[PDB]
Design a protein around this ligand. Structure first.
Ligand SMILES: Nc1ncnc2c1ncn2[C@@H]1O[C@H](COP(=O)(O)OP(=O)(O)NP(=O)(O)O)[C@@H](O)[C@H]1O
Ligand SMILES: Nc1ncnc2c1ncn2[C@@H]1O[C@H](COP(=O)(O)OP(=O)(O)NP(=O)(O)O)[C@@H](O)[C@H]1O
Ligand SMILES: [Mg+2]
Ligand SMILES: [Mg+2]
Lengths: 452, 375, 59
DNA sequence: TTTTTT
């Protein structure tokens, strides 16, 4: 009776909710928290005891009576609620930061946006300013990794766009590759991003690319649920022998809003994908099969500034893989680990988000960077497909080797082989030409652009 | 004794039932629910407390006595009643909608049809009309994905019949393949379907078609129990080196009314197959064994419209696999995610059902669409 | 009970069943044939009936 | 008991 009344006033505050996945989220310390192995509901009961009248607060000091109140609470929670539906809100440990504005909400204002994830650190408005003498050093670091030159113009913009999208709690349709040689600043960029978003950043394994995602317990993919930034590192030169290729099957799966995969000792097979997936590379990736659906999901950022020791500087100024060579800063790595640039980089990310990802958040691919897509890109501009616009032109097509078969358009295999040998040699694309012939095999409905 | 009379009175209202599989289904808030990891019987005991007499209601406020009532109820439940025997009913969170007429039943009327699953959302009879601009916008979306042209007439009809089959809860004799190239609208159709039926829609992994099911817990199979639509997206290019060529025996099991599979920490191994299984494909399927039984189990719906960007428009118009080229809507996935077209696509599905699947529901195969079946 | 190309080429789904059916024989694994004869492998109570489309070849 | 292991 008395412990039933206490449980009712707790649900009157809407401080505990039931989610569609069966989790009980609680509102403690200005944040929605959930944990499958922690007593969070009884934690809320003890914390909320100050907002109760005098006769009710004294009965919440007994752990046994807090379990009775908790048992009452779980019986009254019959309907689920939707959580994490605002993509333009950045949730901290003590509130939610609006990204369309610079406003910070802490209290009942941040409760409306049921963000069950958070960075894990309290937001500091005294460091989220602009001037911030650490911000000068951060500008020095960023302007070295991605120089502000005319040559590094579209690459710098892509770099800013990709890092900014890690603040958006929506589904991202592209996978970005951080490509560069050694000592170029990719790991520095990763460590700066991890310092700025905290627990919203997760580091995952290499399986999520090169193996099936649903073959039993796969914690390496179930840990990406509601994470806004996923990093994979150091693909082991898949173009060489003894390697498993990228398996473009997973590339399309990782783009979908829902990724199938379950943790250990649980049946939750659906995870929500809000993550910008970035892979650090020293070599360009190679895929098992190249498809137009694969070239629509790949972007590449190039790192071309080398940070070297004074001894081996001259060996780096004569390398074609570097555009600039700079002194390595030995204390920079330890300063990032101490979250010195935690809020300056966050201010940078918010500014870039306002510049790029408003009002529509979307990541666009760069097919012209991957060498594996060169054949498909060339064929896309080399051939016209079938018919309809060419039937009246067949009078002029009697010459130039064009013949008629099946009454649409045809080309003999030998004719097409000889013609395609005149645009690019088979030294590097011989297997590619053979694969195209086999996949589109005899007659070939394809017309050259110059013969129109 | 008093807690035994409370349990008997609760049992007299037929709000707790036992299923042949072993589930305990409760009637809370105009919907049958079952869950093996949630105190659903105690939730009903607390909620039903307003219908019991005055002296019996105070005894139900103590949690410890509610587990006593629950134990009494679980001991009383010896019989077992069949569930989900109406294939033309759409269960919502606040009632059941008839798919033959337009009547919506809420309350004790919806209780007769023991629909243990639900869409998960409430039925709002304000957008379920035909009018309002959501329908006009949606009809443009559908008419661009599958144009009303005469050459697409049979394909458009097969598209309508397959989607409307997700409304009917029964065993479907065909597995439909959604075939098309990139930016053809297959995932848009899937996302429209998910918002329309909600919890009656589940996505499963690739092991339901390529891997032997009988090993340990199989949540990817146990989650298809009573679901009316199962999507398995991203069919890989098995016609290459190092791949698994689906499985012809799985299709036989996936067409059977009973599917074997158990969850984690659970003994329930029988699942009822009520789902229209659709696979999102950029490549048409191949199989290890091509039998005669496999012939009447596969249907193919082809998407031939490209939603390109202004930059890459000229190249798209010179492609064989595209019949029309349109403009991609950047702010359309957000509208679908916010469930804007939830009750308009639902009305479209209901109309297609009334036109196609009454009074007989059946799906026909299209083997003259796969190169393998030609021989 | 119905089962295809698994038992010949489900231990729980063979117990006390009075009949077990196998279909469309796609060798036949005579070692598996000898196993189903013994009462204990669960207990065998099923007249395991096979229907074929073409004349089968043993190993 | 599931996972781990086969
Ligand atoms: N702006 C900078 N000025 C000076 N040193 C820097 C700067 N940015 C990064 N460094 C340092 O340069 C070193 C190499 O950078 P690092 O982050 O390791 O790039 P990397 O690409 O991950 N190396 P690798 O893994 O071989 O590709 C580290 O010790 C960094 O602390
Ligand atoms: N009728 C439409 N009008 C405008 N844009 C549309 C329409 N239908 C779909 N789109 C958009 O077109 C894009 C591609 O659609 P999508 O659902 O991804 O097709 P898809 O075939 O599944 N992609 P893929 O996996 O490569 O085959 C998405 O951004 C959709 O929002
Ligand atoms: Mg590194
Ligand atoms: Mg898709």
């Amino acid at each position: 009776n008395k412990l039933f009344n206490i449980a009712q006033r707790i649900l009157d505050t809407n401080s505990v909710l039931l989610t569609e996945r069966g989790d009980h989220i609680v509102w403690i310390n200005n944040s929605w928290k959930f944990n499958s192995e922690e007593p969070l509901i009884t934690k809320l009961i003890l914390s909320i005891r100050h907002q109760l009248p005098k006769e009710y607060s004294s009965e919440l000091l007994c752990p046994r009576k807090r379990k009775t109140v908790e048992a009452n609470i779980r019986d009254m929670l019959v309907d689920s609620v939707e959580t994490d539906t605002y993509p333009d809100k950045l949730p901290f440990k003590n509130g939610v930061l609006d990204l369309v504005d610079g406003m910070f909400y802490s209290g009942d204002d941040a409760k409306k946006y049921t963000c069950t994830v958070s960075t894990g650190f309290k937001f500091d408005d005294t460091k989220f300013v602009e001037d911030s003498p650490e911000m000068e050093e951060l500008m020095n670091i960023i302007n070295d990794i991605q120089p502000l030159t005319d040559e590094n113009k579209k690459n710098r913009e892509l770099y800013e766009k990709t890092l900014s999208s890690c603040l958006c709690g929506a589904t991202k349709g592209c996978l970005t590759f951080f490509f560069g040689e050694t000592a170029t600043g990719k790991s520095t960029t990763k460590r700066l991003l991890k310092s700025a978003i905290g627990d919203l950043f997760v580091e995952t394994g290499q399986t999520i690319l090169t193996d099936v995602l649903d073959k039993g317990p796969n914690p390496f993919i179930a840990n990406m649920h509601l994470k806004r930034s996923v990093f994979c590192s150091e693909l082991p030169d898949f173009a060489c022998s003894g390697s498993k290729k990228i398996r473009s099957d997973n590339i399309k799966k990782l783009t979908e809003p829902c990724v199938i995969g379950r943790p250990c000792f649980s049946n939750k097979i659906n995870n929500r994908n809000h993550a910008t997936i970035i892979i650090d590379t020293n070599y360009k990736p190679v895929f098992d099969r190249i498809d137009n659906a694969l070239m629509r999901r790949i972007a590449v950022v190039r790192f071309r500034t080398h940070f070297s020791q004074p001894s081996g500087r001259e060996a780096a100024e004569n390398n074609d893989a570097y555009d600039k060579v700079k002194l390595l800063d030995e204390g920079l790595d330890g300063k990032i680990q101490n979250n010195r640039y935690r809020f300056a980089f966050l201010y940078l990310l918010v500014k870039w988000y306002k510049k790029y990802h408003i009002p529509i958040m979307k990541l666009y691919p760069t097919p012209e960077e991957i060498p594996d897509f060169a054949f498909y890109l060339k064929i896309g501009t080399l051939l016209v497909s079938s018919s309809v616009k060419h039937i009246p032109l067949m009078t002029d097509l009697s010459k130039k080797g064009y013949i008629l078969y099946d009454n649409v358009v045809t080309l003999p295999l030998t004719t097409f082989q000889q013609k395609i040998s005149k645009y690019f040699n088979s030294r590097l694309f011989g297997h590619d030409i053979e694969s195209f012939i086999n996949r589109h095999k005899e007659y070939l409905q394809y017309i050259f652009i110059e013969d129109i």
